[PDB]
Design brief:
part of a larger assembly; 9 chains; A alpha+beta (82); B mainly alpha (140); C alpha/beta (148); D alpha+beta (118); E mainly beta (156); F mainly alpha (80); G alpha+beta (120); H mainly alpha (85); I mainly alpha (50); E: 156 residues; mainly beta; four-stranded antiparallel β-sheet; 1 helix; 44% strand; flat; F: 80 residues; ribosome; GTPase; Ribosome assembly intermediate; 39S ribosomal protein L42, mitochondrial
Chain lengths: 82, 140, 148, 118, 156, 80, 120, 85, 50
């Protein structure tokens, strides 16, 4: 009858204590999206900057080039994780 | 000139190697380079403090965000987790928020549960049994 | 400084300690002078310590050159193909033994800035956060202010 | 989980469109909410350099409410560069002139003062 | 002590009723039991653990590398058990201790794979107009641990 | 510029005042009187100073060894 | 002129309600103090700095044990505003030779002769 | 949450005294205990020093009281002895 | 004034703190403040202070 959090979005959380009271146990099975909650699948530098600005919801500044100094500074072989 | 420095090139180069990535005449002229390099090194040393500080504010920001998803405030979460005798630092909690969201919801649930136990204890002045999650493991 | 220096992520050579640990150091070359004060310690090392080190580390091939040189050197080669040249000039036996052991312990990875003190290929078990996690679904999947 | 690398990345950093109703609401509280969402502070993957901000749509900005006598008292000050270009209008005057101005200015104020703001 | 319904008559937060201790204790037993049963069966997939080692909490998994900013006085290739596990999580369950999980419950094993110096760190002091300038170079000893395995035993 | 006292500042002050009030109380009850106290630690106090005096008096140049001098010949130690 | 402050004796006289507020009794007084410096000696006179040095309280938030005797008390009175004083409590005996190594001072102010990290 | 920890009789800092710091971080996989941690050694040493100080101060004060009592008894005995002749 | 002094609910008074030098407060107080008990500040007098 009591839930600390509404269990309808992420997972159903059940909190418990071990008999000794030393360990807290959490059971969290994932919540799956129902069928009913779903929906069926249906079947000129100046002007250019403005077009791009509007399309991607940015300011104009991003779309202007930068000089040789900045271009050549950039790391073309950056370290990759994972 | 009985004695004169023959190794001045290398002495200059020691300072200059650190200046290569600077812009302007700072990168190549020693008189200007040395001054900027001293500043660079000083900044580098002092930046260690800020690194640690900035990480912690980042973690708190992230924890706040994740807690707010579950309708819990940052102080509430941290406070109640401590009262549950769980000792998870801010770095780990931020990591859990990003990578283990089910676990984070569990922790948010636990914090919220403990919070309500606190309120019930506060409201119920006098002789009342301790909350189930409220009771603490004693070490001797 | 970091901005003035290359960086890398924490890595192993071939998942070193996953299946079995393989010592990365492969070859160790020493250049020692018969006569010369610089190589004094080095000589004493070769006299007493190198035989025992060779016994302890069978995977490493040790070469001792014993030629005229002003500065004695140790060259360490690793499985990944890294080469490290370290001067043992005017060093005590203790210092040389220390350095040699360090080379044995080290891998072939570059001693530069390591970006993160941890590395994982499976960071998430429950699933990485996205905006739609912690969001409830709605009936018929209706957007806000949608009639149908 | 168990997504390909590219779709995983895509889902994580995706932009989300939110709706706010401004009817009988203080501009500052709307601004507070909007500021959080626009910066991406609501997302636990937040970082300044991650540009993980989200779209915020606010409607009924004409129907905002002010506590107290803020319609009369609160003054918006602007200077055209020219001498005698200093103009001060009350909140009520600005609202009649431009309905979206008050909420816009409130949000703008609460956003961080850097190049990302605009 | 009745007060008619106004805005300030009642606290804004909703009334919260917590379950009776007896029912809750029973419920806790059922939850613990089913989680135990999952551990017995091996329903869990990959595990993640939050381990306390060298002052810092590490969120670790199998085949994970960690960098420790000190010498561990262990030969390379030596397998060690990391004690002080705070939290152990699966896809469907998490066990978190107060503050530490028991030894019987969880076992995490790692191996020393690399012992290195850090890249040189510059310490620089400068005060203007005082002729005050100092430079130090420090390298910190480091150890790399490969987290070999995380294992859970049915002890709840 | 005028400075003003916040609620936080008042709280911080009262916190410290509470501590020092308790300090007063614990200083209120001494275990021994002044007469009982007299000369109880005298022996220990004395011996401690003799230790200091001994350290001061023991100052003298270190020993010089023949081995140290002869070991410098090893700078020209060579293989045959 | 700023000078040394001489404190009236009346403030060091405990009222009955004080005996209620803090767990102590005038008969059978505590033998030892625990003293920790909780406030810096910077922006503080030289005499207070010197007395802090004598008491061995150079480092903040470290507990030091002192005799509860008039002479020590006199020194504590000068720097009372820099320090926190709690009575040292011994739930068991004061430590013997066998249990000398295995000791811990708890935050409650009690020194325990047995300190094994096992839970109850 | 330092104040709560103090109420429960723990150290305000979790990095203080308690099983989270004082226990060994690691052990050998086969089961051999690890060589003791350098910080823990230091902590044990400081604690031993504190305990040695506690016993010494206690002993000094009780010995002082005994000495004073003997002096008082001697004075009383002397004064009653002088009543002769 | 006498009634206000007796009636006061504030545990902390200027007089008490000043006389005992409770926060090392005598550093920022005048010797005259001991007698004035915080009621007098320069030529000005506060009747509203206990």
């Amino acid at each position: 009858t009591y839930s600390p959090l509404p269990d309808d979005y992420n997972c159903n959380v059940e909190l418990a204590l071990t008999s000794d009271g030393r360990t807290i146990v959490c059971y969290h099975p994932s919540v799956d999206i129902p069928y009913e909650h779903t929906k069926p699948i249906p079947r000129e530098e100046g002007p250019m900057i403005e077009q791009l600005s509007k399309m991607f919801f940015t300011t104009k500044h991003r779309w202007y080039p930068h000089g040789r100094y900045h271009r050549c500074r950039k790391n073309l072989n950056p370290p990759k994780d994972r | 000139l009985r004695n004169r420095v023959t190794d001045r090139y290398f002495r200059i180069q020691e300072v200059l190697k650190h200046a290569r990535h600077f812009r302007g005449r700072k990168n190549r002229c020693y008189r200007l380079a040395v001054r900027t390099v001293i500043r660079a090194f000083v900044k580098c040393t002092k930046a260690r403090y800020l690194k640690k500080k900035n990480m912690r504010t980042l973690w708190i920001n992230r924890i706040t965000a994740a807690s707010q998803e579950h309708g819990l405030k940052y102080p509430a979460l941290i406070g109640n987790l401590v009262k549950c005798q769980v000792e998870l630092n801010r770095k780990v909690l931020a990591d859990l928020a990003i990578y283990e969201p089910k676990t984070f919801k569990s922790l948010a649930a636990l914090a919220s549960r403990r919070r309500h136990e606190g309120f019930a204890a506060a409201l119920g002045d006098g002789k009342e049994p301790e909350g189930i999650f409220s009771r603490v493991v004693q070490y001797h | 400084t970091a901005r003035g220096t290359p960086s890398r992520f924490l890595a192993s050579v071939l998942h070193n300690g996953l299946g079995r640990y393989v010592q990365q150091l492969q070859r160790l070359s020493f250049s020692v002078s018969r006569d010369g004060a610089s190589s004094r310690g080095a000589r004493e090392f070769v006299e007493r310590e190198v035989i025992d080190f060779a016994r302890r580390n069978p995977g490493v091939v040790i070469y001792v050159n014993s030629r005229p040189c002003c500065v004695p050197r140790v060259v360490a080669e690793y499985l990944n193909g890294a080469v490290r040249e370290e001067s043992i000039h005017c060093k005590s036996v203790e210092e040389i033994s220390t350095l040699v052991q360090k080379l044995a312990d080290q891998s072939g990875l570059d001693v530069i800035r390591i970006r993160k003190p941890f590395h994982t290929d499976n960071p998430s078990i429950q699933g990485q956060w996205h905006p739609f996690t912690n969001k409830p679904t709605t009936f018929r999947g209706l957007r806000p202010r949608e009639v149908q | 989980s168990s997504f390909s690398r590219a779709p995983q990345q895509w889902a994580t950093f995706a932009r989300i469109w939110y709706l706010l109703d401004g009817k009988m609401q203080p501009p500052g509280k709307l601004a507070a909410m909007a500021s959080i969402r626009l910066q991406g502070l609501h997302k636990p993957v937040y970082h300044a350099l991650s540009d993980c901000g989200d779209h915020v749509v606010i409607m009924n900005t004409r129907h905002i409410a002010f506590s107290g006598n803020k319609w009369e008292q609160k003054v918006y000050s602007s200077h055209t560069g020219y001498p005698g270009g200093f103009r001060q209008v009350t909140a009520a005057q600005l609202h009649l002139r431009d309905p979206v101005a008050i909420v816009k200015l409130a949000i703008y104020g609460m956003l961080p003062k850097n190049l990302h703001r605009r | 002590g009745y007060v008619p319904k106004t805005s300030l008559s009642s606290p804004p937060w909703p009334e919260v009723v917590l379950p009776d201790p007896v029912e809750e204790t029973r419920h806790h037993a059922e939850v613990v039991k089913k989680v135990n049963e999952m551990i017995v069966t091996g329903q869990y997939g990959r595990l993640f653990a939050v381990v306390h080692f060298a002052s810092r909490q590490w969120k670790v998994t199998s085949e994970d590398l960690i960098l420790i900013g000190n010498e561990l006085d262990l030969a390379c290739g030596e397998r060690i058990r990391l004690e002080k596990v705070l939290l152990v999580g699966a896809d469907n369950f998490t066990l978190l201790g107060k503050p530490l999980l028991g030894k019987d419950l969880v076992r995490v094993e790692a191996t020393v794979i690399e012992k290195t110096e850090s890249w040189p760190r510059i310490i620089m002091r400068f005060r203007k107009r005082k002729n005050f300038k100092k430079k130090r170079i420090v390298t910190t000893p480091q150890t790399v641990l490969r987290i070999n395995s995380i294992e859970i035993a049915p002890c709840l | 510029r005028p400075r003003f006292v916040s609620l936080r500042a008042k709280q911080n002050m009262i916190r410290r005042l509470e501590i020092e009030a308790e300090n007063h109380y614990w200083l209120s009850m001494p275990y021994m009187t002044r007469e009982q106290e007299r000369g109880h630690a005298a022996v220990r106090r004395r011996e401690a100073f003799e230790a200091i005096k001994a350290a001061a008096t023991s100052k003298f140049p270190p020993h010089r060894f023949i081995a140290d001098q002869l070991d410098h010949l090893n700078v020209t130690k060579k293989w045959s | 002129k700023f000078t040394r402050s001489r404190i009236p004796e009346k403030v060091f006289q405990a009222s009955p309600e004080d005996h209620e507020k803090y767990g102590g009794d005038p008969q059978n007084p505590h033998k030892l103090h625990i003293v920790t410096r909780i406030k810096s000696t910077r922006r503080r006179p030289y005499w207070e700095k010197d007395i802090i040095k004598m008491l061995g309280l150079e480092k903040a938030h470290t507990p030091q044990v002192h005799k509860n005797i008039p002479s020590v008390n006199a020194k504590l009175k000068v720097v009372k505003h820099l320090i926190r004083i709690k009575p040292l409590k011994l739930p068991q005996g004061l430590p013997a030779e066998e249990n000398m190594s295995n000791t811990c001072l708890k935050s409650t102010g009690e020194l325990v002769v047995q300190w094994h990290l096992k839970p109850v | 949450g330092g104040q709560w920890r103090l109420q429960q009789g723990l150290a305000a800092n979790p990095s203080g005294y308690g099983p989270l710091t004082e226990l060994p971080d690691w052990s050998y996989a086969d089961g051999r205990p690890a060589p003791p941690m350098k910080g823990q050694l230091r902590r044990k040493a400081e604690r031993e020093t504190f305990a040695r100080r506690v016993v010494l101060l206690s002993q000094e004060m009780d010995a002082g009281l005994q000495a004073w009592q003997l002096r008082q008894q001697k004075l009383q005995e002397e004064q009653r002895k002088q009543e002769n002749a | 004034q006498e009634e206000r002094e007796r009636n006061n609910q504030n545990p902390w008074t200027f007089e008490r703190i000043a006389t005992a030098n409770m926060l090392g407060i005598r550093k920022v107080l005048s010797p005259y403040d001991l007698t004035h008990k915080g009621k007098y500040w320069g030529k000005f007098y506060m009747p509203k202070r206990v």
